[PDB]
């Protein structure tokens, strides 16, 4: 079966508005989901849908930009660091359970490169 | 390489007839394979700019798509049923031709073929 989906609220939780997790939100996450190849990594594997019932034996820390976008929403995330990690997170994953060189790898890859350039121009805490 | 333009989906000099199988193409074929898991990639023209497949227009000289077919529907473009099947043969045999046996695209297109020819063998007697 698949499992729940990362969790995405907590109001246990402290936050805090920035000009780092705007950008996230406004900046990278709203230019990948928009990318020609986002389309798979919108909502968590669905392992039964798509027949891999492995997929959950291999992958122990499932991520995808629905979550990243509703953990952006509230306020899940302290840290921007935080957000990379899941947009890392993500991307391994593909790797780890793919062969290289598939067609679901290369449109990680790709997402990957576009995702790295925007995190360059990650803004200065203000 | 640039695409070609996409399949002719209307034109006024055609004759324009209604049928019960072209209804049942509609209604029932086209809706059923569209909300299918895997349609997405076969819903719109490859696009082998955005894709990143340079070779595709070299192999595949007859593109076909669902959402070329449901256009050509919605727009009375048919004449014969036998048409419109021919269409989905076309995109379906595309795929198997463009990629080979046992690919992740492969598998999607084999699952709605199956479904295709499930509801073809069900079409209305004119
Ligand atoms: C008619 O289209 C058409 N004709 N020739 C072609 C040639 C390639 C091609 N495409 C490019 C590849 C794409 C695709 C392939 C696999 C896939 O999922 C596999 C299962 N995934 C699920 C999601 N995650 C995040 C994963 O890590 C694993 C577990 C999903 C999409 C379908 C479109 N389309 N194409």
Same mark, same amino acid.
């Given at each position: %079966?698949?499992?729940?989906?990362?969790?995405?609220?907590?109001?246990? /939780?402290? +936050? #805090? $508005?920035?000009? $780092?997790?705007?950008?996230? &939100? #406004?900046? =990278? &996450?709203?230019?990948?989901? +928009?990318?020609?190849?986002?389309?798979?990594?919108?909502?968590? =594997?669905?392992?039964? +849908? @798509?027949? @891999?019932?492995?997929?959950? /034996?291999?992958?122990?820390?499932? %991520?995808? %930009?629905?979550?990243?976008?509703? #953990? &952006? !929403?509230?306020?899940?995330?302290?840290?921007? $660091? !935080?957000?990379? $990690?899941?947009?890392?997170? %993500?991307?391994?994953?593909?790797?780890?359970?793919?062969?290289?060189?598939?067609?679901?790898?290369?449109?990680?890859?790709?997402?990957? /490169? &576009?995702? @790295?350039? /925007?995190?360059?121009? @990650?803004?200065?805490?203000?």
């Amino acid at each position: %079966m698949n499992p729940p989906p990362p969790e995405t609220s907590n109001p246990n /939780k402290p +936050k #805090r $508005q920035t000009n $780092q997790l705007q950008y996230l &939100l #406004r900046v =990278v &996450l709203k230019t990948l989901w +928009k990318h020609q190849f986002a389309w798979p990594f919108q909502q968590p =594997v669905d392992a039964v +849908k @798509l027949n @891999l019932p492995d997929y959950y /034996k291999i992958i122990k820390t499932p %991520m995808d %930009m629905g979550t990243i976008k509703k #953990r &952006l !929403e509230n306020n899940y995330y302290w840290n921007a $660091q !935080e957000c990379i $990690q899941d947009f890392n997170t %993500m991307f391994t994953n593909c790797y780890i359970y793919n062969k290289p060189g598939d067609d679901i790898v290369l449109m990680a890859e790709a997402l990957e /490169k &576009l995702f @790295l350039q /925007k995190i360059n121009e @990650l803004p200065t805490e203000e």
